């Protein structure tokens, strides 16, 4: 546990991911109680969450800029303080616009900390970028799962403001305390090291961006429609709880696995295989899941296993393609895709399902995954290395 060992900083990045996962994955519990003090459910709390997700598209690039320039310490301090000041008082605000502002502050801090953890993992493990990125993304995926019942009990007994206050204080304090410790291995611009503006000129960036955006778009509807489809089949409630747990566990655990697989073979081949399997599984999901509880759980596990790997495949690809020195800003620009996908995912899954049938909804999700597969297989490998056009002094 000394300073200088790469695995110490990998553990710290995973801890940061677990500490910032609460903003995204604890929202279901707070949605109804916060709404009860305020107006409409679908409008107020869900638009607050949507704004918190969208603000990351500008939050993570700037935090990555400051990380690449001045190291990760001060930017991580700022992100932790932002998460603190936003998430702590979301239970003590009496107006909806104040809730919007605080949730956006917390989401921006979360985006900054996610970018910082990912960049630390990529820098400290240049030879195992996929594996470190997968471990950090899994920590962000599985962060709140152990304490979800505890925070539910706190909400039930002590109230909404108390729960928000406790969680925000814990998250902010722990992130800030980690900020004192983490450090980078060492700016030297190289030929293959791209600036963010220089990256925004290559077609490879945009192909990867559309693939990631389509993956996130299909994933929103996959998560929104998977368990409710199991309820529509008529499965037992325990089967549905097991399915939810399997979804979360596999969406978390597939990321280090797919990172290692990409390390052993390559970014593009692994992306193609994973996205093709995900597209096929999503296309066959409504038909196969009817076979019973076992088939439903197996399809959920396989689909989420093949969907979650992108959050580990894309960061390592960005570090390999657009340079390590400026990588933190570029992966924020890649994160803009997941931020943009959340604009529509509010009620889109339920709308598509109830309007055009479950089969067509899962076919649309499979078509998104197939767009990603086609981009990974046929489009991006033929382009080769980025060209670095329109360089400026």
């Amino acid at each position, epitope marked *: 546990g000394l300073l200088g060992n790469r695995w110490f900083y990998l553990v710290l990045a995973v801890l940061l991911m677990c500490m910032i996962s609460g903003v995204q994955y604890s929202w279901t519990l707070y949605a109804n109680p916060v709404k009860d003090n305020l107006g409409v459910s679908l409008a107020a709390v869900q638009t607050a969450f949507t704004l918190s997700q969208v603000i990351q598209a500008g939050s993570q690039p700037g935090g990555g800029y400051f990380v690449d320039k001045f190291g990760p310490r001060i930017p991580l301090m700022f992100g932790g303080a932002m998460v603190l000041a936003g998430w702590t008082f979301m239970g003590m605000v009496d107006s909806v616009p104040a809730l919007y502002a605080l949730y956006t502050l917390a989401g921006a801090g979360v985006g900054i900390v996610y970018g910082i953890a990912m960049n630390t993992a990529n820098r400290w493990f240049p030879d195992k970028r996929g594996l470190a990125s997968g471990f950090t993304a899994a920590g962000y995926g599985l962060g709140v799962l152990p304490f979800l019942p505890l925070i539910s009990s706190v909400l*039930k007994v002590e109230g909404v403001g108390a729960a928000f206050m406790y969680t925000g204080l814990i998250m902010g304090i722990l992130i800030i305390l980690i900020a004192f410790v983490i450090r980078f291995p060492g700016i030297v611009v190289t030929d293959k090291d791209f600036n963010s503006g220089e990256m925004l000129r290559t077609p490879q960036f945009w192909v990867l961006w559309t693939a990631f955006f389509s993956v996130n778009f299909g994933g929103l509807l996959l998560v929104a429609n998977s368990v*409710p*489809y199991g*309820r*529509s*089949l*008529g499965l*037992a*409630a*325990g*089967v549905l*709880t097991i399915g939810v747990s399997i979804q979360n566990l596999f969406n978390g655990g597939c990321r280090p696995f797919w990172g290692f697989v990409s390390d052993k073979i390559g970014r593009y081949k692994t992306m193609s295989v994973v996205f093709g399997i995900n597209a096929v599984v999503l296309a066959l999901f409504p038909t196969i899941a*009817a076979l019973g509880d076992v088939a439903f759980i197996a399809m959920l596990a396989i689909a989420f296993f093949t969907w979650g790997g992108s959050y580990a495949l894309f960061p390592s690809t960005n570090s390999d393609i657009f340079g390590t020195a400026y990588s933190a800003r570029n992966y924020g620009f890649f994160w803009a895709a997941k931020a943009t996908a959340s604009i529509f995912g509010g009620g889109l899954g*339920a709308a598509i*399902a*109830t309007n055009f049938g*479950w089969n067509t909804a899962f076919l649309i999700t499979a078509i998104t995954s197939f767009i990603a597969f086609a981009l990974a297989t046929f489009v991006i490998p033929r382009m080769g290395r980025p060209v670095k056009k329109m360089v400026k002094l």
Partner: antibody
Amino acid sequence: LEVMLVESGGGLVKPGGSLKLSCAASGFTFSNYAMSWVRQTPEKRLEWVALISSGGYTYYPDSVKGRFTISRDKARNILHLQMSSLRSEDTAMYFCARGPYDFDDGPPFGNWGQGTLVTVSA
Amino acid sequence: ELDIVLTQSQKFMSTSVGDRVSVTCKASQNVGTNVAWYQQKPGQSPKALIYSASYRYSGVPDRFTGSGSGTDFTLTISNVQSEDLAEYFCQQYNSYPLTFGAGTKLELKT
């Protein structure tokens, strides 16, 4: 707005015979909700009899499976319970209840109807 | 056996207006938190009180609460009123077949 469930078709019938119970539904579509038939014994004991899901899949307990058939008519929003091979145990009052919403968590019997009585004895 | 069985210990319970009562439901198998509580007034069909063993509906009074997990569940009626006296059953929907409790009738002490 309000959910309405009207049971009908109950009667006094000799055992070993047929019967058809109808449940007229109002205020919701049979697509996004599940429906169930539950009877109560004259000794005030409840036995869940049948449950048809959103997609049309049917579940019956082993005690009354095979004899009874639960179905629905989406065009007219009627839940049908076909009864055959009536036994002395089948004497009970049947209610139709709507289950959880496809995207919502809830019990299999959210709202209950008035209920219709089916008696098969001497 | 394969079928789960919910047993309510109190077939008959006597109480007074304004007091605290608890109806207990003991499951033969682990059903987690997928348990509901229904109230059947003598002349009407059962009305849904509790879902998920801890959540009540909108329009269900704050007098009724639910707690428990695993195999042990409790429906607590705090500040019992005259209308509260009716029959209460616990139903598990964790797994098929769906089963009901014996039934607890609440009446005033003679």
